[PDB]
Design a protein around this motif. Structure first.
Motif, short mmCIF file in Angstrom:
data_model
loop_
_atom_site.label_atom_id
_atom_site.label_comp_id
_atom_site.label_asym_id
_atom_site.label_seq_id
_atom_site.Cartn_x
_atom_site.Cartn_y
_atom_site.Cartn_z
N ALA A 148 -5.37 6.20 -7.35
CA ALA A 148 -4.86 4.88 -7.10
C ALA A 148 -3.88 4.92 -5.91
N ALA A 149 -3.06 5.97 -5.88
CA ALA A 149 -2.08 6.14 -4.80
C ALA A 149 -2.75 6.42 -3.46
CB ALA A 149 -1.12 7.26 -5.15
N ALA A 191 -2.23 3.94 -0.13
CA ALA A 191 -1.81 4.49 1.18
C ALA A 191 -2.89 4.28 2.25
CB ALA A 191 -1.53 5.96 1.07
N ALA A 192 -4.14 4.51 1.89
CA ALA A 192 -5.24 4.42 2.83
C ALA A 192 -5.24 2.99 3.42
N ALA A 226 -4.64 1.40 7.20
CA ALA A 226 -5.71 0.59 7.76
C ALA A 226 -5.23 -0.74 8.34
N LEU A 227 -4.19 -1.30 7.72
CA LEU A 227 -3.67 -2.58 8.16
C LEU A 227 -3.00 -2.48 9.53
CD1 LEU A 227 -2.15 -4.30 5.03
CD2 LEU A 227 -4.40 -4.68 6.07
#
Length: 14
Positions: A3-4, A8-9, A13-14
């Motif tokens: 989930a973590a 983070a991924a 990406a943003l």
């Protein structure tokens, strides 16, 4: 762990 990894991924990406 997984989930973590995703949190983070997406944050990067943003």
């Amino acid at each position: 762990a997984a989930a973590a990894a995703l949190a983070a991924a997406l944050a990067q990406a943003l």
